Amino acid sequence: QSIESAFEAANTGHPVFATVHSQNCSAVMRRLISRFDESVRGAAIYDLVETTRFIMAQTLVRKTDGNLVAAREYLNFTTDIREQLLSLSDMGKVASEVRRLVDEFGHPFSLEAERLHSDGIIDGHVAKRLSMM
């Protein structure tokens, strides 16, 4: 019911900011879809792709200092990306696709870990942990 209310607020023309307890963007999509039964699950996937504009996953990792930094995956849902997500003939794959697309067009946790690691903000170990997210 929360996810549906977010849908309606979005489609009634309003920015909706929402928090999700998932590890990463793929996990966000999959988790959101899990809420909806198979009978409604097509409609739900279409609503979710059509209304989503942007997905950020965050985690806290240890800086070389010992302080924490927020590493972020994000995918930005351009009209291109959403058009691509809709046209996968099987929607069981949507989540997977998102991953792919995040990898191709977004800022995956691997890329963020490379980026922190190049700036020396992060060790190799937590870099590896973080890419694995």
46 belongs to the binding site for a second copy (CB under 8 A): yes
47 belongs to the binding site for a second copy (CB under 8 A): yes
For residues 22 and 84, which CB has a smaller minimum distance to a second copy in the complex? 22
Tokens of 70: 């927020």
16 belongs to the binding site for a second copy (CB under 8 A): no
User: Nearest 5°: phi and psi at 60?
Assistant: -100, 130
63 belongs to the binding site for a second copy (CB under 8 A): no
1 belongs to the binding site for a second copy (CB under 8 A): no
128 belongs to the binding site for a second copy (CB under 8 A): yes
8 belongs to the binding site for a second copy (CB under 8 A): yes
40 belongs to the binding site for a second copy (CB under 8 A): yes
- The correct pick among 15, 19, 37, 124 for binding a second copy (CB under 8 A) is 37
Q: How far apart are CA 107 and CA 47, in angstroms?
A: 24
Q: How far apart are CA 129 and CA 31, in angstroms?
A: 22
Of 8-16, 70-78, 100-108, 113-121, the segment contacting a second copy by CB under 8 A is 8-16
Q: How far apart are CA 22 and CA 84, in angstroms?
A: 23
